[PDB]
């Protein structure tokens with residue numbers, strides 16, 4: 066695994082946190098196997114998470130009607146993005162594997178990490194309308210979420226009061242990671258870390274290092290391939306008619322988001338096929 | 339409707355935006371019906387969206403191992419939260435109706451709005467473990483999302499390339515809003531707003547104002563009531579045995595998150611029953 070490069074994006078303010086220890090465990094395990102490891106500790110960086118015209122240097126094209134998508138895309142093509150954004154984009158370009166380490170907050174990513182996606186995943190660089198999802202710019206990379214929660218796993222089971230964790234993960238793993246082309250690996254889910262004692266926390270750290278010894282060879286999560294859809298406005302970007310006809314008598318839909326009104330395949334966003 | 343109060347939280351930097359126009363339309367229509375209207379224009383406020391120990395003044399309980407949940411709950415009880423947080427909490431306490439107006443960004447809320455939830459929805463003030471979801475502190479209030487998207491409506495249909503919008507809405511409407519006790523009203527979904535001509539946009543604003551004339555009398559979205567679950571940590575907050583047995587022979591699950599491996603009832607997060 067010499068020659069492969071990893072990026073660990075951490076979103077936690079405290080160096081005493083378990084999230085920080087998971088970042089250190091990941092970095093140590095990957096380096097031991099020959100990886101180059103680069104980090105984005107967003108809190109330690111004082112990372113600015115708010116998109117604004119200060120993400121762009123030089124001339125704005127239409128300052129009287131500011132449109133962040135058009136202006137940032139033009140800035141990317143012309144080399145006029147803010148230097149802190151350019152630095153993060155270079156880390157992404159270099160990385161084969163991207164690990165996102167964060168506590169679950171309000172059933173999603175921390176605001177500082179959401180803003181990192183918004184400022185760094187600029188159009189053309191991270192996605193194109195003509196090549197969404199599996200054809201996206203990051204299709205040669207793999208991404209993985211490593212999440213800690215306060216709530217127990219049972220709260221996020223099919224019968225738990227919070228509802229299916231697979232639904233919670235969908236907008237992040239499909240809408241952010243896979244939209245840009247990433248193959249998304251099984252998330253590392255560390256449930257109710259606040260009710261886990263010290264020696265058990267050590268084994269959680271060791272298990273994560275163990276998994277990282279062969280993470281590049283894992284099967285990724287299943288998303289419906291874009292070849293199943295008519296990618297044009299005359300068809301409305303809907304699934305092809307012959308695909309709908311083939312699926313019409315299967316009991317399960319294709320994924321969490323493409324459940325088709327049927328049963329969601331079990332752990333679609335948690336376990337590979 | 340004189341006597342009732344609304345809070346409009348806007349997450350868009352541009353006064354020239356359609357989001358700002360929707361905020362202005364909402365304020366004018368409610369005021370014309372006698373509502374008191376307060377605003378949290380997060381960009382114009384320069385709102386700080388990043389949780390940290392600077393959200394808390396005075397003596398921390400354990401500064402050597404800072405844990406935001408325990409420290410912020412204690413700070414709320416002792417009156418040691420940062421003044422900008424306190425002011426937003428007072429806005430929430432006064433409001434009967436809360437409108438969230440924002441463009442969809444990476445299939446969720448903008449980072450500045452995500453951080454508003456993180457800094458303002460403090461434990462004990464906005465939620466308690468002993469009274470989750472429909473017993474929560476905001477159970478006398480109603481909330482509504484007013485979202486604009488770049489993508490078209492068909493892209494978010496069951497057969498569309500992005501998948502079911504009901505799945506994308508679930509973590510925000512059930513997890514952020516309903517967990518605190520809000521009754522959640524049908525979201526105002528404005529699709530492909532960058533490809534909607536001017537004639538149509540004007541009518542969208544008039545329709546939004548029309549809806550707001552009787553917004554308080556609408557039926558809210560359906561979430562499984564907390565009485566269906568055993569509400570204690572030891573029991574994992576799992577659905578009651580008798581309830582599981584009774585739902586076993588039903589063809590549809592109860593909601594997006596409580597789909598129970600069965601068909602999701604149509605537009606559970608988009609249309610009231």
Ligand SMILES: Cc1cc2nc3c(=O)[nH]c(=O)nc-3n(C[C@H](O)[C@H](O)[C@H](O)COP(=O)(O)OP(=O)(O)OC[C@H]3O[C@@H](n4cnc5c(N)ncnc54)[C@H](O)[C@@H]3O)c2cc1C
Nearest residue numbers: 081082083084086168169170171172213214215216266406
């Ligand atoms: C705004 C906010 C929103 C939240 N929303 C949700 C939600 O929606 N759903 C949900 O389930 N939870 C939610 N939570 C809870 C959150 O997910 C947990 O608090 C978080 O995952 C805890 O992870 P941590 O790194 O902070 O652990 P910490 O509390 O910092 O540490 C946990 C334990 O691990 C110890 N530890 C540290 N380093 C090591 C080491 N090398 N080796 C062994 N042990 C170590 C620590 O000393 C500590 O005892 C929220 C929390 C906040 C602040």
Ligand SMILES: Cc1cc2nc3c(=O)[nH]c(=O)nc-3n(C[C@H](O)[C@H](O)[C@H](O)COP(=O)(O)OP(=O)(O)OC[C@H]3O[C@@H](n4cnc5c(N)ncnc54)[C@H](O)[C@@H]3O)c2cc1C
Nearest residue numbers: 133183355356357359441442443444445486487488489539
């Ligand atoms: C980081 C980022 C991430 C994004 N992620 C997603 C995603 O995941 N999925 C998705 O579908 N989209 C996504 N988008 C697109 C985003 O949702 C749309 O760009 C946004 O909703 C557009 O709303 P707006 O208010 O900015 O519209 P504007 O472009 O500001 O306005 C649209 C038209 O309405 C006009 N208008 C303004 N005021 C009025 C008025 N009083 N009366 C009549 N017309 C008026 C405006 O002049 C303009 O011509 C993303 C955008 C960004 C920047």
Ligand SMILES: O=C1Oc2ccccc2C(=O)[C@@H]1C[C@H]1C(=O)Oc2ccccc2C1=O
Nearest residue numbers: 171172214215216217220259467517570571
């Ligand atoms: O489930 C949750 O959802 C949240 C959503 C928004 C903000 C914070 C939280 C939490 O703290 C966690 C975990 C939370 C915890 O950490 O400890 C508990 C102890 C007893 C009963 C229940 C729990 C929990 O669910």
Ligand SMILES: O=C1Oc2ccccc2C(=O)[C@@H]1C[C@H]1C(=O)Oc2ccccc2C1=O
Nearest residue numbers: 297298299300488489490530531532533534
């Ligand atoms: O309205 C339309 O309907 C069509 C019917 C048949 C053939 C072509 C088209 C179009 O190009 C689009 C324009 C189209 C639209 O209206 O929605 C969008 C939403 C997001 C991004 C881009 C667009 C468009 O270009």
Ligand SMILES: O=C1Oc2ccccc2C(=O)[C@@H]1C[C@H]1C(=O)Oc2ccccc2C1=O
Nearest residue numbers: 134194195244444445487488489490493532
């Ligand atoms: O504006 C657009 O341009 C297009 C042109 C041709 C075909 C499809 C599209 C789109 O999907 C939309 C919206 C587009 C979308 O649907 O999802 C996103 C997710 C992340 C970031 C940005 C966006 C968008 O703007």
